[PDB]
Structures are given as C-alpha cells and as structure tokens.
C-alpha cells in the first residue's frame, strides 16, 4: 500500500509524479475525511476527489468502495483516466514497527514487558541523529535477550553496516524479515511480529486516550489502514451477473469465505465472529424477501438498524417491516409488527416472524432502530452505549438466539463501529477492567470478515471514547 502518502501535500504530489513518475503514475493522499487520487497523464497531473463521511469512499465521477485498496485494485483492472504505476512512498510513519522518537531504555522496557520471540521495532537513533535502531527480542531469567542493530543513513540510503543499501527503512525490514541476520555465535535475529504496543489493560484506557489525543489517533489509524491490502479476499459471488442488482453499491461486496449463504443463495451480508453478528447492507426493494429469509434461517432474534430510513433526502435504509399492528408477507416469510416503543435515541419494534403455512415456526424478532446518529459521529457515546447495553441483555435473555443482525447504508461504516464497540464492551462486561483490549487488532479481525468495517478516523476515535466512557461508568 505504498501508493498512499500520509504526510504529502498537493504541491509535493504533483512534483513527485512529474519528477519521479511517468504517465499513468498515481498516488493517494489525505486532504479535511476528504482524499485525493493524483494521477499523471499526458504529462499533466489530474486530481480526483474521494470523500468518506463514514459510510463508504465516494470517488467523484467514479464508483463507491469499501477501501482505497479495493478502489485502486478495481481501476487497475477495469471506468475512470489510466492507473498504471503506483508511486511508492518511503515514509515509515504508518508501519506497525516504526516508533520514530523513542528512547532506547523505553524500547528495552517495552520489548521486555510486552514482547516475545521475534518481536521487533525500529526507532530514531538516540545519539547519532538521522540514523535508526532496530531493536529485536529473541529467546524462549536470561533465557531471552534484546538485540540492537544500528541502521545508518548515508546518501538517502539505509544499511546495517554492510551488504545491501536500501532506499527506505521498509525495504530493509522486508529484506531482513526474509533473510534474517545471524549473529557470530549462531543467534538468528528473526523479525516475526511488530511489538504489540496497542494492546492495553482496560483500566489504563484513559491514559492511552490522553496520549493519543496529543494527533496520535491519526498515526495509529493510518497504521491500521496501511494493512488493508492484506484483506483483499475473494468477492466473486457478489460480482456474478445474477447478483449485481442485489448490492446497494456494485463494488461493495461480501467476502466469499464469510458471506451468508441462503438455503438463490446470495445476500450482501457477512457473519462476524470475534455472540456473533451478521453485518449487512440496507435493504433494496428486491432484497427485502432475502433479508427475512436470512433472519429466519440464521435464527436471529435481534436487529440493529444504524441509520434513519432517510437522511439528507437520500434513502439509507428501505423500510422492510410492517406498520405497527399490521401483518405483511415477504415471500414465504410472514411478519407481524406487534408493538413499537419509542426511546430517546432509538425505536424498538417487536416483530413476530414465521414461515407461511407453518405457525410452529414463529419467533419474536426485536428490532432496535437507532435514530440519533448525526448526518460524522456522536459527540457523546452514552446513547450508543445505553443502546448496545439494552441490545445485549435482550440477546442474552433469548435461549439459542442466533447472530445479531446489524445493518443500514452499505453496512461497513456505522455497522462496523457498533459491532466493534459491542465486541470490546462485551469483554469488559464479563471480565471487568482487569483485562486486555486491543482496538486496532479487533478492527483488523473484523475487517477480515467484511470489507472496510469501521470507515473513518472519527469512528476509530469514537470507538476509543465509547470504551473509555463505559469503563468510567
Ligand atoms: C507514529 C508511530 O507510527 C505508527 C505507530 C506504530 C506503532 N503503533 C501500532 N499501530 N497499529 C495500528 C494498527 C495496528 C495493528 C495491530 C494488530 C494487528 C494488525 Cl494487522 C494491525 Cl495493522 C498497529 C500496531 O500493531 N502498532 C504496533 C502505534 C502507531 C506509532 N509508533
């Protein structure tokens, strides 16, 4: 994902494409959640705007995508003008192993307290300015050790004192991950995993929120984004001709290996397993019956709607339930709206779902429709937390209840935010504040089951704020 330049300006982008790029070279850069796709063509540099308010990436005049990597992969194969040569960035800021300003004793303390065999980091050198240090832990009292390797910078190239000279710290790390250094007496300096400094004890959430607010939220979030290229899983079923009109957006698709299979078998939906979840899109008129088939088949008893039916005049979640006290059939599924109850932040609809001709199949489905999410993110997490707390208790009170359905819009943004908050709060509810939480890792685990779960930095920070607020109360 080297084609994304985090700290690049617009003038710097045009200069990079014109001096170190050729026609068809491209890069992406932040703006502000506005983004810019700068492409070189016919000796010129055209700029294309990409907007993400929290639901999806919207390319001006293009299509809508779940991740910039999926956007770039799409146009490097299909419709825009020409994306041929990604211009790679040498900035290590977004790497999981780069820590820039970091003391050598603090780095030894980190690797000792939180590291394992093969855990490593790269930092700016304590003494010799402009150089870097690669600190790596190895071993299984005295059974393990921390080894430091000086990384010199000479003529914009990097080396470990001998051998190849690398154009960037990343090339050096990748090289020495595949060909690890061997010490004199046999010790192999294997670079297995970056040091996990994002996993924190739950009681220390407020301290970390203070550090990240000094921002640090941005640096951690774009480090999470840099790894999305590892989540380009297969999405073939949602591209077949018969399933194109079942997707709200043609290029926001469910991963084949986690999608819900209807027993046609397609719906834009994925099972999220950390209580499990079904993350899906807002209904279309032609998928309402498939939605209810899914709810019935998976034995789901709770539904979370993340958006209003309409926001800013645009349909975000098509109505798929009957009016209060009414009864309606959706294909072979029959649904009665038994009762609606109005809270401040949401509406609760008690629905009874059954298959036609089989009254024995009847079950109650509790529909929780959140309605006070702004047209960015909420400034107070209390409403969302109280909402999820009630949702969790309803789910826990129903024996053998299936996965919780969370949906609306494209089903990746607010949907991923609610689900990740619910996963994290679930750990603290059962195990108290004396437990480990890891917000980036939890999101990456969920993004490997549906594309682009959690869309924006504002949602990423809101997840932290929600977890902090829950732990305080
Ligand atoms: C400003 C410095 O540069 C960035 C910086 C590097 C260290 N760091 C960090 N950020 N981060 C974001 C997501 C993930 C992640 C975790 C588990 C699995 C996967 Cl797949 C991922 Cl992507 C990680 C991660 O592991 N670390 C260690 C904090 C931010 C700063 N020191």
Residues acting as catalytic residues: 408
- Counting atoms of ligand 1 from 1, which one is nearest the CA of 102? 31
Distance 230 CA to ligand 1 centre (A): 15
N-term to C-term CA, the chain: 40
Ligand 1 contacts CB of residue 98 (under 6 A): yes
SS (H, E, C) 50-89: EECCCCCEEECCCCEECCHHHHHHHHCCCCCCCCCEECCC
Domains of the chain are: 10-86 (3.30.505.10), 216-472 (3.90.190.10)
Distance 439 CA to ligand 1 centre (A): 10
Rounded Cα distance between 414 and 453, Å, is: 8
Residue 240 in tokens:
């077949």
Cα distances from 276 to residues 329, 346, 403, 419, in angstroms, run: 28, 22, 5, 9
The candidate with the shortest Cα–Cα distance to 181, out of 195, 163, 169, 165, is 163
Sheet holding 277-280, edge to edge: 269-272, 277-280, 404-407, 302-305, 358-370, 346-355, 333-342, 327-330
Distance 297 CA to ligand 1 centre (A): 39
At residue 15, the 3 state secondary structure works out as helix
Distance 220 CA to ligand 1 centre (A): 6
- Counting atoms of ligand 1 from 1, which one is nearest the CA of 227? 22
Breaks (C-N over 2.5 A) in the chain follow: 31, 32, 78, 80, 140, 214, 263, 274, 375
Q: Consult the annotation and say whether 375 binds a ligand.
A: yes
Ligand 1 contacts CB of residue 147 (under 6 A): no
Rounded Cα distance between 469 and 473, Å, is: 6
Backbone angles phi, psi at 318, to 5 degrees: -60, 140
Contact predicate 388/422, CB 8 Å: yes
Among protein residues, the one with the nearest Cα to ligand 1's atom 1 is 219
Contact predicate 8/94, CB 8 Å: no
**How does strand 34-41 pair with strand 314-315?**
unpaired
Cα distances from 277 to residues 66, 87, 239, in angstroms, run: 19, 38, 23
Ligand 1 test: best mutation among 123, 220, 441, 445, most atoms within 8 Å of CB?
A: 220
SS (H, E, C) 356-399: CCEEEEEEEEEEEEECCCCCCCCCCCHHHHHHHHHHHHHHHCCC
| CA angle centred on 441, ends 473 and 167, rounded to 5° | 135
> What is the DSSP code string of 106-129?
HHHHHHHHH--TTEEEEEE-SSST
Ligand 1 contacts CB of residue 442 (under 6 A): no
Q: Consult the annotation and say whether 413 binds a ligand.
A: yes
Contact predicate 312/414, CB 8 Å: no
Ligand 1 contacts CB of residue 96 (under 6 A): yes
Ligand 1 contacts CB of residue 369 (under 6 A): no
Residue 471 in tokens:
């732990």
Q: Consult the annotation and say whether 380 binds a ligand.
A: no
Per the entry, the structure determination technique was X-ray
Instruction: State the Rg of the chain over Cα.
Output: 25
Rounded Cα distance between 121 and 110, Å, is: 10
Contact predicate 120/195, CB 8 Å: yes
Distance 198 CA to ligand 1 centre (A): 7
Q: Consult the annotation and say whether 435 binds a ligand.
A: no
Resolution in A: 2.2
Q: Consult the annotation and say whether 409 binds a ligand.
A: yes
Residue 246 in tokens:
């079942």
Rounded Cα distance between 109 and 113, Å, is: 6
Neighbours of 429 (CB within 10 A): 12
Rounded Cα distance between 317 and 307, Å, is: 7
């Amino acid at each position: 994902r080297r084609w994304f330049h985090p700290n690049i300006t617009g003038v710097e982008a045009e200069n990079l494409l014109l001096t170190r790029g050729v026609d068809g070279s491209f890069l992406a850069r932040p703006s502000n959640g506005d983004f810019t796709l700068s492409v070189r063509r016919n000796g010129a540099v055209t700029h294309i705007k990409i907007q993400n308010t929290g639901d999806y990436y919207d390319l001006y005049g293009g299509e809508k995508f779940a991740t910039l990597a999926e956007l770039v992969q799409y146009y490097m194969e299909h419709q825009l003008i020409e994306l041929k040569y990604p211009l790679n960035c040498a900035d290590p800021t977004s790497e999981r192993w780069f820590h820039g300003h970091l003391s050598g004793k603090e780095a030894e303390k980190l690797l000792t307290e939180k590291g394992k065999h093969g855990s490593f980091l790269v930092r700016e050198s304590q003494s010799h300015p402009g150089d870097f240090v690669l600190s790596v832990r190895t071993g299984d009292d005295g059974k393990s050790k921390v080894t430091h390797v000086m990384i010199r910078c000479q003529e914009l190239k990097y080396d470990v004192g001998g051998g190849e000279r690398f154009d960037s710290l990343t090339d050096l790390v990748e090289h020495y991950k595949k060909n690890p250094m061997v010490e004199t007496l046999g010790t192999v300096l294997q670079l297995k995993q970056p040091l996990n400094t994002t996993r924190i004890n739950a009681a220390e959430i407020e301290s970390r929120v203070r550090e990240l607010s000094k921002q640090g939220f941005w640096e951690e979030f774009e480090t999470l984004q840099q790894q999305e290229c590892k989540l380009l899983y297969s999405r073939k079923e949602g591209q077949r001709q018969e399933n194109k009109n079942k997707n709200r957006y043609k290029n926001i698709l469910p991963f084949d290996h986690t999608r819900v299979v209807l027993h046609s078998d397609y719906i834009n939906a994925n099972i999220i397993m950390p209580k499990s979840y079904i993350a899906t899109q807002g209904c279309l008129q032609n998928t309402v019956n498939d939605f209810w088939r899914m709810v019935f088949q998976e034995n789901s008893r709770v539904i979370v709607m993340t958006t209003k039916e309409v926001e800013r005049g645009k349909s975000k979640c098509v109505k798929y339930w009957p009016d209060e006290y009414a009864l309606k059939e959706y294909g072979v599924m029959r649904v009665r709206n038994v009762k609606e109850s109005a809270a401040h932040d949401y509406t609760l609809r008690e629905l009874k779902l059954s298959k036609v001709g089989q009254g024995n199949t009847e079950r109650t489905v509790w529909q929780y429709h959140f309605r006070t999410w702004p047209d960015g993110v909420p400034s107070d997490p209390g409403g969302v937390l109280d909402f999820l707390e009630e949702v969790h208790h309803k789910q826990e009170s129903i024996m053998d209840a299936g996965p919780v359905v969370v949906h609306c819009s494209a089903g990746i943004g607010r949907t991923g935010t609610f689900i990740v908050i619910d996963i994290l709060i679930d750990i603290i509810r059962e195990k108290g504040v004396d437990c480990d939480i890891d917000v980036p890792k939890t999101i990456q685990m969920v993004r490997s089951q549906r594309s682009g779960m959690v869309q924006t930095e504002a949602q990423y920070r809101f997840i932290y704020m929600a977890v902090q607020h829950y732990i305080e109360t």
